[PDB]
Amino acid sequence: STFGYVHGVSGPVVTACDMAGAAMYELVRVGHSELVGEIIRLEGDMATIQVYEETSGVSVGDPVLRTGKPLSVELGPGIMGAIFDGIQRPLSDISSQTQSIYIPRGVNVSALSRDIKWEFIPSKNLRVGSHITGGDIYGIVNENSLIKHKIMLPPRSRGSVTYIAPPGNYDASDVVLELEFEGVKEKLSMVQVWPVRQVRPVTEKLPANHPLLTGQRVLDALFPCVQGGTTAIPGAFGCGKTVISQSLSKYSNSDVIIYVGCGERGNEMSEVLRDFPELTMEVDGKVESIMKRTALVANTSNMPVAAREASIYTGITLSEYFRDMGYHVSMMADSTSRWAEALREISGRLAEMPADSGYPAYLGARLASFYERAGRVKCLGNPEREGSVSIVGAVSPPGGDFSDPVTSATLGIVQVFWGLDKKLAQRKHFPSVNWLISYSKYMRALDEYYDKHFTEFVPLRTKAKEILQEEEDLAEIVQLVGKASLAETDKITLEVAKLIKDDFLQQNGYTPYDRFCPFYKTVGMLSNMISFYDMARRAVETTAQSDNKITWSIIREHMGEILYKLSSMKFKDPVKDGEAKIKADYAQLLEDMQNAFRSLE
């Protein structure tokens, strides 16, 4: 039978009998209200279930209905714009259908709606008898104005097409393909189902080559991430995380966005779910909602501990499904520290050996195996395509202690750290990225891209990092030397470090000219600031060696208009001024500064 029966209850643990063919880690529905749980032990014809919901009122002899599956995702049309929790309950459909402010115990709404009808177009040259394999695109659903949703044959499925549906409107429960292999027939609808703990297969996993642009001058120049990359950010109150989340959502070269809350505070989760629907972007000269290309997983701190832990596996499995269509995906996890605390609580319920700081022995392997799902890929199946998933995971070191087991593991794994900083936010220095603590390890992989497309940039990045580091060495000298007694070369360093810091690293995201900064504007600004620095250094070092010296005071007194034009470069608007117009103006500052230095020399 599909039913066993409750033999006993002790807190969240249920023991059931007549469970003989039930497999390890299957999901089950317990009692007359159908509470969800998972099988954690087998013994004889009995099973031990870890129930996710309150077991209060469950009785001996109550039905235990078994699902033949582990924890898994419905993958199909209806995911874009959706709100889910960590076990894929549709929070907005539950709200709409129940007319309640609460989540009912043992609620059993399907994650994708089976009453919405979708416009479906088949792949045109598939016919009865066509040979078809896992990952093959056999039709497209027009889900909205932005996302064409590509219907694929599941992994671990293959055969010869015995039926394919004509163009039309279909429920997610309608059969749209049948195929046959070894005389056995498989019938398929628009929804496939996949286990959250199994990595979705690919033809090949590839090195990451192309930047994940954000439109920020810092990040995109000094600390780049690739498409398929991995990043961590500090998750703390004052630092200002939202610039990462909103730049990814509005301005990245991602095709799809997945956001995971994984045990957040109720009032913080409410702020995300209020704010995200109000975000918009301009597509083909028309403004569109972010929720046409976005899905949210949301979990407050009083959701089931099984959901708070499943959350990142639900979010990465959704991300891998859109990668397999040939999209580029960014996934954000709102705090991996809240996920790790849920993992710790589960190991505590299981009475496991407490290892490092009370966290289970597998913590670092679970983090490693999760971040190993990031990357660029060659997809399974016939139409030849590439996709990627890029992961940003926030992490919350207690009091800023990076020796925390979750933070220590995370920075041991990730290839970028964007160190957002409360002290910079208190200075009104926005975006609040600390350039001393932050790093990127993708700078070699991007070398071929920058060489091909920009060519001048790698030298400029190298000089700019040195100038910002020299100022941090000169500061302790200035505290003794009293600024005036410093060398003129080093006064140039300090004041150009201030020029880069105030006019390149800072970027006011509320202002129309600086909401997004394209990479041509970014390299153009830096090119001029470093050109000015080299000419100012050359004027001092040519004269001060034996002639009547030039000084940084003489340069400022002679060149104050050039220095004002340099501070004005950030005000150029990429929408009102064309690429060629901005480039021509930035060439005019180079001509003007070269003329001004030639008149000084």
């Binding site: 002790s10 929070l91 913080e268 701190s301 710790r344 505590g348 009475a351 009370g358």
Partner: protein, 464 residues
Amino acid sequence: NYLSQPRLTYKTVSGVNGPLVILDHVKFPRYAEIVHLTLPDGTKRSGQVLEVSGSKAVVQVFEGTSGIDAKKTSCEFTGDILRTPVSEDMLGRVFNGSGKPIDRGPVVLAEDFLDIMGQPINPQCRIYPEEMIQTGISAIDGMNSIARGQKIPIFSAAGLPHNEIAAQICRQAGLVKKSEENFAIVFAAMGVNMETARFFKSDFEENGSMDNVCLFLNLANDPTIERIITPRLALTTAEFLAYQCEKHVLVILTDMSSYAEALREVSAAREEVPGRRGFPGYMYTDLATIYERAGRVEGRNGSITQIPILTMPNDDITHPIPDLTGYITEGQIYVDRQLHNRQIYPPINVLPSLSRLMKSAIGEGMTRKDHADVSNQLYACYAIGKDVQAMKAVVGEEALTSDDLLYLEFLQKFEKNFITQGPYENRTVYETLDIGWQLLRIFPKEMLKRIPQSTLSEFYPRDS
């Protein structure tokens, strides 16, 4: 609809051990069911089914297991879990930690019966916090301001006045009265000694505020399960009053440190192994089930705001109870031993205290337009004043500048006038802000660098 079937009574007690009675031959045992025991002398006790297995049930008795035997003791299984009657008639009433009346009024007529475990609020239905809750205490309202739908703990230690502060917040709290009968309080107190419990009950009658207040008292020698039930009765009442009767409810939960001591005991009675620092491994998920019964919700005009109150051992903020509370709640109000020793009341220390939602509660149309600027400038002056006061003992007062002597004058008058307040003195936010400006006027207006020129122009000068 109704439960309708007659009850079964068993004399099938197999064994008795610690707080637990074990019965066999029980018909389809229900987990967490309430049962009534009658003892050999006719005394009555009650308990709850702690585990079931086949025909066996084990009951934790709320009162003792003394005088119980296997032969004459009978147990009546009621057929159902714990549900509380709930109504608006509960405002003006005093109850014990099992919901029984202790005020010589009658027992509650239900408008409904609710399961005390509740259900989680859907994240889609919770809307962001907004306007102020006015506590009447300047160190809170002026600088650690509380939003409708916030949750914010008071952190304290043994022998500090946190119950006198809680009682003052209960007597004084309300809405700001800009330019209501829709405000109520649920006050819950866990593991209270009889001196403290008599103080709470006496102080709210004597100072005549009971018509807004539902009060639940659990004493230090009441059953430890009634301490587990007490926050759940209180929050099941606040959920009826807020999300069905559309009130703004303030909930005060007193010694969550006493609650955790009972949680550790019920965990030990289940024969679980002790977790990290000796508390149950699931204590985060348990505390989060209390603290997230809070907020504003879409389409209903009520809200629940929580003020948990906690005692820390060794004055240590890194113990599991304050530490896990910090991951769930959004701020802290810090009660200080040094201000208490200096004879200041309320001894609230504003430098480590924070309300993370303060910007959502304050400003034009919610308090007054200058509130954010005054709060920022009072914090900035006090943080400098404590630093000048430290260097005065190193450099001597003759090495201090004229500006150091202004911070040294502000520091004394801030603590005597802004922080120091009577236990029966109630200041509106407007009075709090006016006391704030009397202190800022100690300085030349060039010193007030956290305040913009528009706010200085409207509020720095005195007027008739």
